[PDB]
Structure 1
């Protein structure tokens, strides 16, 4: 496959994609601040199980806009008001402190977003889009929580900030670990936890951490929607992923692993 490869300095060239890099991408950071817009664009060959997603949120007077689009054809990365949502961010701690400024979405297909991440919670609330929406998806284990919600109606993302400790136990229990089979996901590190909220599937996923080529694995609790290559790709920076989810407590046990015609 081939794609444009561009550094943020605006210099680009055609890149012959490495074996198993099967996507092209454009990553875009846009910052509007009291009159000025700044923009940084990267392009490159990427590894699949990624989707298109965008997000805009307020920090003080600034607006920050994050975007990735991906595509499959040679050089397909070449060239490139509405619903009212709540918005806030974490850098200024505005999500957490409760100062939630209002934000009109610039595009008809954007919806209200809420996205929580931690391994120091990071909270971003604003306008954006993903293929799922409206919907939500989520994963948590002993030290990890990722959550995403999209709503189709006005200021629907208003509310206290979603924290794991306020979702009641599901009744489902699943094995918990992250790392590889020797480090972080050894048997001594893999143990049962109580699932919470709508995260009522046991999950295991393996793929290749993208930044460095190492094997990665994760186990825990998930929404059914989390059991999806792109979402796991996004959340853990992974690719060429095998996922399984199952709805019997402990069915996440590493001794119950089975490859899925990856194959």
Structure 2
């Protein structure tokens, strides 16, 4: 495979898709202010397991629209009525209860609530993810919910179709009652992030009752990541987890008994 690699500025290229790359992507961000708009586009050989998608949300009077689309074969990236609640953490419309209506413009796109929450500290790290987002869209696995958390992250998605089906209060992790299961937490590589002494037991909350182990590659520059934590049923499948951790070619394992998912219970390679 070879894909079209277009930088945001306009500058293109033809990329020889590297080992296990296998997908052409076109990602499009379109912003619409009052009567005013722009759009950015990147393109590249991407990880397989990706898939077409969309996200859109009001923040103030600004309306952001994400879309990304994928296709099988060479240089395919080369050419050219449902209501939901909307808000973001850009303008703190989510935390400050400024929720707005957002009519979806498509048949297939439904109400969404997404939580990206990183703990960490300060500088380099903690991706620029809005961390609370609500609006129309279609995303991996869909209608459904899934989540993960571990000692330092909480990801959650709620996908559904009914008028304002995504309303409700902002969904914070310590607002979700312990479920009784306890699973190892860690995240990095057997050297760092998930060495024996950084990996430890934690209290699963809310719907996340399965102990998770995911191994994959850390496609933002390699290193072959590992992740342990508390997953929902859903996240344990269809590589939904990759999107949270931006991982490629993940093998995930999900045991339903407390404290399985210990390191020495792993399958591997």
Structure 1's 131 and 145: CA in aligned 2 closer, same or farther, altered over 3 A?
A: closer
CA contact (8 A) 1:50 1:231 kept: no
1:251: Cα distance to partner? Answer: 1.0
1:131: Cα distance to partner? Answer: 4.4
What secondary structure sits across from 2:208 in the alignment? coil
1:10: Cα distance to partner? Answer: 2.2
Q: How many residues align structurally?
A: 259
CA contact (8 A) 1:111 1:151 kept: yes
Structure 1's 78 and 121: CA in aligned 2 closer, same or farther, altered over 3 A?
A: closer
What are structure 1's unaligned runs of at least 5 residues? none
1:121: Cα distance to partner? Answer: 7.4
Instruction: Report Cα offsets for 1:116-174 as digits up to 9, x if no partner.
Output: 01119710101100242211111001111000001110011111101111111112111
Which whole-Å CA distance do the structure 2 matches of 1:51 and 1:179 have between them? 25
1:28: Cα distance to partner? Answer: 0.9
Which whole-Å CA distance do the structure 2 matches of 1:116 and 1:251 have between them? 26
CA contact (8 A) 1:204 1:218 kept: yes
CA contact (8 A) 1:50 1:230 kept: no
Return 175-184 or 5-14, whichever deviates more. 5-14
The aligned counterpart of 2:124 is none
Instruction: Report Cα offsets for 1:85-128 as digits up to 9, x if no partner.
Output: 10000011110111111110011111001000111971010110
The runs of at least 4 aligned residues of structure 1 exceeding 4 Å deviation read none
What are structure 2's unaligned runs of at least 5 residues? 119-128
1:222: Cα distance to partner? Answer: 0.5
What secondary structure sits across from 1:97 in the alignment? coil
Structure 1's 112 and 30: CA in aligned 2 closer, same or farther, altered over 3 A?
A: same
